[PDB]
């Protein structure tokens, strides 16, 4: 049956990996839904529950990125997937800046060097990266050097034994380990169409829906470990648990091949067999008990949905506060610290076990801590203004 559907999910994954790079989470999801509607409309066999973050990559790579300081988010994981299976060297659009450090940590074993287009030595550095093979991450694509057009186009001439790229006037060689990574810190910028054609975009900018989903995930992890654990289980129901079953089967094959007639001499292989049977049974049980778990986790997510909406709204309030005064420059990381302080290390939640009461306490303390941290960095006249915005956000959030 998986063979009967490989065309469809391969089509979706490839179309998502090529396109849907620049768009935000909402547009990516809308495009994927429109695509899937088309193929189901065209009687194309595709699995109804593609987890793109799971189909294109397995557990070990996700763990490696997490150890590479990749934030554990759906959009971040999808971006990292794009950063792995790329036919054209991607362009990173990360105003926050975690993507760059994630690249350097990922390729530090490959001796990745950082360079900027503004640097006059950049071309020289490029030559080195091209001539030796060490990957290079080039920053500040706003001043993109057109001398990168050959490397991006992959036109290489093999004359004699020489695999050359005419980088400007020179004709330097290429080493097979080379790979370029273009980077951007400004989310608002326009590129020439040639650049857009020759690169695949990877957008790391955070939007309203993206931050709302991230905050909802963090709430589900912190307050409801059972719901988050089950949602992660269904994230690993496809691909991962099956891989565990396959490695268990391989271990069984090795163990049974190892015995020289000991299949009955010890009568201990039955213990391993019943272990595999129990693991297969639990996998099958989770496989049949899905729809219940989606409806339950969806109810739980809807429970905290107003909280996530409030978080996104207040964060964008902080971002837009830059118009009131130039001193009001606040980062996403700052709001994340606010969010950790309200969620963990909260004296008010201590000793409280009611989920609804803890949720109400968390909504109150979120606004309280946000105002407490922001007003300290504000002039006295603007404290009333921020209180006004927080009140309006609470009015939008509250029901009744």
């Amino acid at each position: 049956n998986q063979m009967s559907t490989i065309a469809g999910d391969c089509l979706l994954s490839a179309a998502f990996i090529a396109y849907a790079g620049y768009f935000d989470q909402q547009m990516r999801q809308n495009l994927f839904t429109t695509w899937s509607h088309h193929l189901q409309q065209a009687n194309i066999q595709f699995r109804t529950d593609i987890a793109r973050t799971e189909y294109l990559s397995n557990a070990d790579e996700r763990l490696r990125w997490q150890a590479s300081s990749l934030p554990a988010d759906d959009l971040c994981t999808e971006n990292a997937i794009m950063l792995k299976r790329f036919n054209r060297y991607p362009l990173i659009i990360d105003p926050s800046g975690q993507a760059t450090e994630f690249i350097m940590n990922e390729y530090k074993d490959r001796k990745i060097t950082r360079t900027s287009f503004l640097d006059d030595a950049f071309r020289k550095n490029l030559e080195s990266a091209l001539r030796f093979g060490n990957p290079l991450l080039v920053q500040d694509v706003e001043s993109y050097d057109p001398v990168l057009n050959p490397v991006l186009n992959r036109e290489v001439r093999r004359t004699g034994g020489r695999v050359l790229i005419t980088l400007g006037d020179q004709d330097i060689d290429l080493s097979p380990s080379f790979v370029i990574f273009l980077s951007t810190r400004d989310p608002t910028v326009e590129f020439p169409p040639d650049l857009c054609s020759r690169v695949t975009f990877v957008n790391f900018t955070v939007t309203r829906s993206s931050l709302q989903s991230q905050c909802l995930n963090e709430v589900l992890k912190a307050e409801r470990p059972d719901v988050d654990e089950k949602r992660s289980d269904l994230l690993k129901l496809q691909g991962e648990f099956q891989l565990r079953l396959r490695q268990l089967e391989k271990s069984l094959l090795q163990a049974l091949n190892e015995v020289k007639g000991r299949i009955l001499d010890d009568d201990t292989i039955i213990t391993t067999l019943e272990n595999l049977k129990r693991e297969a049974a639990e996998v099958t049980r989770k496989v049949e008990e899905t729809d219940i778990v989606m409806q339950e986790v969806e109810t739980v997510s809807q429970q905290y949905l107003p909280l996530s909406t409030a978080c996104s709204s207040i964060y964008f309030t902080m971002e837009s506060l830059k118009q009131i005064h130039f001193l009001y420059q606040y980062s996403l990381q700052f709001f994340l610290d606010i969010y950790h302080n309200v969620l963990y290390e909260n004296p008010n939640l201590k000793g409280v076990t009611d989920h609804t009461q803890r949720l109400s306490i968390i909504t109150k303390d979120l606004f309280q801590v946000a105002f407490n941290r922001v007003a300290r960095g504000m002039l006295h006249q603007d404290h009333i203004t921020f209180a006004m915005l927080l009140a309006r956000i609470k009015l939008k959030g509250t029901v009744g």
Partner: protein, 50 residues
């Protein structure tokens, strides 16, 4: 009086970004409210208006 040398400010921000301080290190910048302060420096700091 860190606001007197903006270039110095951006280069300190670059140095701070790629560094692992000791668990008790604290850098304090007393500064006059001025637009000459870098945007990135503000973004990476805990702002205190006096």
């Amino acid at each position: 009086n860190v606001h007197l040398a903006p270039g110095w400010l951006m280069q300190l921000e670059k140095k701070l970004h790629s560094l692992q301080p000791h668990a008790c290190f604290r850098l304090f910048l007393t500064m006059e409210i001025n637009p000459k302060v870098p945007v990135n420096l503000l973004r990476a700091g805990r702002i205190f208006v006096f």
